[model samples]
Target: GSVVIVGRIILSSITAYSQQTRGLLGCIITSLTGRDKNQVEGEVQVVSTATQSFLATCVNGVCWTVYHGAGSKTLAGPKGPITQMYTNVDQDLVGWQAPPGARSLTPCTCGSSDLYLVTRHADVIPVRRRGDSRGSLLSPRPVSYLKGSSGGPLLCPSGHAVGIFRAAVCTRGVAKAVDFVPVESMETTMRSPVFTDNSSPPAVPQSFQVAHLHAPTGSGKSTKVPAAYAAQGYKVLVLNPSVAATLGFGAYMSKAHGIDPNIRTGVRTITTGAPVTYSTYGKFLADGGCSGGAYDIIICDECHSTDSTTILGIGTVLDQAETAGARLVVLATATPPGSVTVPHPNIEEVALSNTGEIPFYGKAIPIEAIRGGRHLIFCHSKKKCDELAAKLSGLGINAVAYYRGLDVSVIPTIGDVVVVATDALMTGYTGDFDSVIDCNTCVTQTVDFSLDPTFTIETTTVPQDAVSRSQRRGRTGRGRRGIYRFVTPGERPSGMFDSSVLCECYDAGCAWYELTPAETSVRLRAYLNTPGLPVCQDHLEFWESVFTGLTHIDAHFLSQTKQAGDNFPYLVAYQATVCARAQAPPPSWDQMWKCLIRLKPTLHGPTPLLYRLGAVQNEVTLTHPITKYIMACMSADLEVLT
Candidate 1:
């Protein structure tokens, strides 16, 4: 007699009958369990190893495993099924590839009403997708009564199989949410590259464009360009104002480009050897202007922010680094501000072509609408993020707060997941967030370094700027169609429109203009080695006062003075005294005292103020108290008073 073992099955009891005939019998290894009458009848064990057993059932030979507690990755069975798709750990999900001639359940295109879940009891239980208030499951899953049916095939009304039962969440002894991972992301993950090396810099051409690259948001320009430069053997330095921005850039560069840039904060020496480095512009200057290594390419990620004093100072650092043999300087931003032009005798400007608009239904949505998929809410602060997350959780949406320093492992990679995040998610982060809802303070912000001693509160939003608005809208619409929703019941300006601060003279081909004369002078002083041109006494004093109290400015000048090793406060007084000696304005006593604790540095450089005041006609906007204080403070040097 010949026999074949098909699979392993556990049954409560079975009646066998034998006839007196010469014939072959096919039998499966069945375990009989002496249990209660209510217990399941048949339990199929699909995969088995020395350590653990994984429950699976094959319908038409297409086997689905729980994959949740599988002891070994190897598929063990009389007829081993091929491994098809499995989920990345973040989401509890997986699928298997059936061998040749295996059958699979038909997917349901209609709805969940016809769905049935095959239970361990060998019982066909009516299962349906969890639906909204309208009685239709938003998506499909096994029925609620189908318990202990994990990793079993879910059948459609047409008797064809659809989704595999993964797991479920129960609240108060009732299943609240039936859960399963989508097969799409699982397939995408399996196909991705297993290994990548971004540390080594590839060789690039000696001659290159020291250009300013512009593109719409979500254009992938920021992430792609840096990696391309690095691959060409360029030592790249990416400078931005926000810590989170740098971290996000580094993460994206590593994930998509196979290169992770080096990121450092605080007063640390710039270490050499990595192909790319990410740091705020302030740190680049604080580290003696990257004196440690000669970089081939330097990138200002948010270079459109010429209105920021911190950005201006950083731009000066970039200029200095360029003058010191750096081959290329790139201003990589979507909206290049009209102010703060890069002074290059051989300047090349590169603008990337837009990928066109996202298809939203029959109507093509503009890139400005940057929307699609599940909703991801962006709040201004962490507290606000948590508040929104808590509200969404109460509504059963399963929202989580995702921010800097938070562990990314716990965040779900698939399913109907929602995240409430700050600006940290706005740049360089790649995730399956479908749509976005921005709370009052998310996008329109930049780093303002001098306001705090630690510069901990570095973000400042510009609700009136077009470039920032465009960048914010571009965050979504990467994988699928997405939408950007603005919920400002509090009416915080969302920067939904373009800024009018820029004038007609700011038209293309008009050229770049620095914010202040002092900033311009600093640029010239650092790069061209020209002592900055002098301005009127009032203006000079004003410049001296602004620079006197600033942390970065103080560090810059004090590092130049004889009292280089003195504490910051003591060095500030020395800087003020030097400014007075430099025939510039000195900081007031109160201003000098405030310098020790808080920083409220002016936003723009000299040119912006002079332009606003129309200084060419001697028309200036200065209050009596402010004007009087500048003259009186600079007139009597503390050294003379002492």
Candidate 2:
């Protein structure tokens, strides 16, 4: 969709800092953006010639550089001549002045301390009342010029560069005109380049992983992380979770009609699951179909709830993107996996056993509560959410309902309050919000938690406690003050609290933790009890005897590879390293298994191990990112098997 408007456009808010009124707002435009400082730039520009000054040149109406001398100017240089005065085609006011008793110097103004403005074109109507317009202030006539229009061109009506208007009388709408600067006096300044100032918004570069993100939540953590990226040439694809939503919802915006409206490039396209009146999702699907290989940025919604086929399809797209050279950003608001909790026990154990020490009681927080800065409250269902929200609203807390099924077009901002349904909060769907209020009093009481200072603690299974704090306290420190307002009195069932419940949690356990000797013993017993034991009964008895502190065991009990899975390296690596002599370097395998360490026994099965006997250096092959993570800090004593 293309839109258009016309006339002169300029950076208007700049104020003069030193005598050298450089580019926009006295800040020196740096040669490079996202870098470079401007606060104390020695001068608007470096001086190379006595009479000449330099300025930066505008590129495609955007970035500029500093030009020291007239030959080559930079963006941070002196101002250019304002040949024409223009405004939008809508209601606008024309300023007038009761000149210096002469038609020669006096010009029009906005009357009273106001800047000079005029209808972009001559015939537009002037706004009269407060409610006169709903049109954009940014749409047209949005700028006001500062004083300094002396002897400038009041451009001849052809709309070509004409003249500058200067000097104004505030009480009455008027200003002095600077029809033109004498060529003799202005040539020196015009010949040189004038630099403008720059602004640094403090941007940090980051890359995001797509799969880890859960959808239907709105974090806006999409691939476009920086404004500079948007400033660059890139196509953006906006996927508003629901149809009937405005595409104008992202942080990015277009500059002008002909210019790209998307923050980055003009190539942006949009789609929605729900269409506006008379609009069908078919058009959106068609847009996606036509998007083809041209798309460089893909911002998707509803990823977690996407059909398995869609998941696989997008996965293939991402996989192909490695070769296609595209960036795919998937942002989710919650890690609260809605209603489904996938089994990831092995991963959970590895992380929990080797992470930093478990902190003091009530100190460890559930991942859901920690990410609650944004108010993504997941009730068991939307109906329940609406019911409770209505009740809460009656108490005077600003409340609004949000869901994957609603339009994101007007969803409240990061610091706004919202209520949602489901445990999907942890799955990236609860996205950036101000606070969380769990409304399901049933689920609230069913959850294992405490409430003295107002917190829910998980006290059953393996974990002694898992506290659920209000999301307000989770996002901003100031939210802690609001925590008291949301905590309600309740007692959950005791049976729901268990250590086993912690087994499936992976949020706080990415890193591996060490095991105490007692824990190691406990784990060993559990591993031994695992079904499908192929060990001979006699040998099993002997090992059990030895484990129970029996010093001597029959040699026959130690059949080679009989108890392969029962190796010390498997259960007591740390203690064994401390107590036993180091074993001779182990043999090697020609090929590693996919689940390398997970199924180490099968990988090192009956087949003879392959090795390069006289190799200069030993090595091992790793096929997965997790394998690399596991080997990152392996102790030096553990040799790399060939």
Candidate 3:
């Protein structure tokens, strides 16, 4: 009964044996899922590394977990045919581990054809002595198909538990060479706290809870958990349709309950009565979230994307979930929102090990590192992407540019080439790249904020935060190990490869604002509370003309960017403006122009203009017609100037 390979069946004694008892237990419970946690059942140990301050260790990557137990049954534990941990296993000699058949999915071939893997649903994988516990899964199935088998045991010929799968190495890009931590490391992990510090006994879930399933990219938080809950007959609403689609959402849901899931473009989907539905946060709001159904769970995958709409929508989901008495709200993301304005009454964090990414010094990587493997290189803009790709291809390196102007067909597939891209490449490529390179540790952006009202494109290097970094870092490292490099060679970057820092740096909603001062949000929030008609009425005269033709700005694009108050726009202009009554003072001009850049967007560009003209460049922009017109619009109203 103990160490069962299916579900969290034997969590009790295993979990109780470990706790401080809850905190450490919660840490381990934070890492593994259902059956995977079950396999990691020995003395559980939690340890803090330089980056995570969090990777908990265990017999099988378990730091802690929960179990269903009845104390009336007593602590006496006994029999089941078992696979004991192997001793003196030679890492030098690799072998075929066959899964002895169980149940009825695939049966024993009388004498056991030994065709399978670790057995049960998990098949046998070949272990090559890569390190502490590594080898190739080298399975007959697609590499990704076997990726879910990560935390489970790797069996030997006679069916002995050897090592556990830690990661998959598909270095050539498609081959899933499975890597693992040997039982030596399991004891390396198991005997650690059992002998040195503390220990696991057993486990178990509750309702109306908000648990942040905090894990890095390679971990299964996105793929595994929802399917497990949906299996329980709970109506699960997954907010990221991309994550859901990976789990057969848009694909299979169409054949089943007739529109069981939706990401409605302009309309709402009537409840189709499906147990599980996949949708985005926008559609979730459009469909009336918890109001339309008595769903058991709402999941916000990739929760760090807090644009004007996304963050407010999440706040609403939090409100509605509590009001509707929904059972659970799971925030699953590679980057955890480091800070929050308000606190949730029951927000518990379940962190998986932020392992794999050992951030080395960035910028100057091995040339072979650049030459080797497929890569997704992120530059600040489309022009920068072009410059880099052409430069790379100069050396005969196969590289292409990817950004909004190019068709989606430009996405590279099945090549060791590089795709030099802008941040727009972040979503929906539907392809895998081995590594991510961020060359834009800092980017110079221009904004036209002038009381004289010239499209005065002044420059500023926006603050790079953990959220944007996390999303870039998140692009790779799904099943196998991934590499994230920051190319600011002259200046060393913090958290080099450490993901914990990436998880820490995001201000969430700042994405729409793009590297704004910390105080702007405070000003914006205050304006949101009571956006008076006078504010809109006052600015509509001067401000409206300034924004109309040049509507491609941040404060413009999301112009109708709604919040609960329903008057988000009028006040947003005030966040950066300092108005003086009667006649606009020179300082008012300065403030008016100062806010316009952000108004248009702190990042609206001709960034390459620096390369074209080489520095001290806002002066060079005045003659550009678009720039001149923007100037004409504002200076035309000099009648207000004193």
| Candidate 2 deviant stretches above 4 angstroms | 1-220, 223-227, 230-232, 236-290, 297-313, 319-378, 386-435, 439-642
TM-score of 2: 0.24
lDDT of 1 by residue, 513-573 (tens): 3134444445423322211111011122233443233332343343333223222233344
Tens-place lDDT per residue, model 2, 1-642, is 000011122221221222232343222223222122222221111211222222211111211111111111112212321111111001110111111111222222222221222221222112111111111111222112312112222221222211122122111112111112112222233333342121111222233233233321223343222223355655444443332332333322232212233321112343332111111122232232214444454444333222212222233334433345455433222321111222222111111112222111112213333233444454545565566556546755455664334444334565535454443233223233334344323232112111111112232212111122222213322313322212232212111122111221110011111222233233223322322111001112212221233122222222211233222212122211111222212223212111123333333212111211211122333332322332332211110000
Candidate 3 lDDT by residue in tens digits, 383-432: 77787778788878788898754666776577678888876576546555
Query: What alpha-carbon RMSD in Å does predicted model 2 have with respect to the real structure?
Result: 29.1
Best by TM-score: 3
Model 1 is weakest, by summed lDDT over 10 consecutive residues, at 606-615
Q: Point to the candidate with the largest lDDT.
A: 1
Order the numbered candidates by lDDT, best leading: 1, 3, 2
Candidate with better TM-score, 1 vs 2: 1
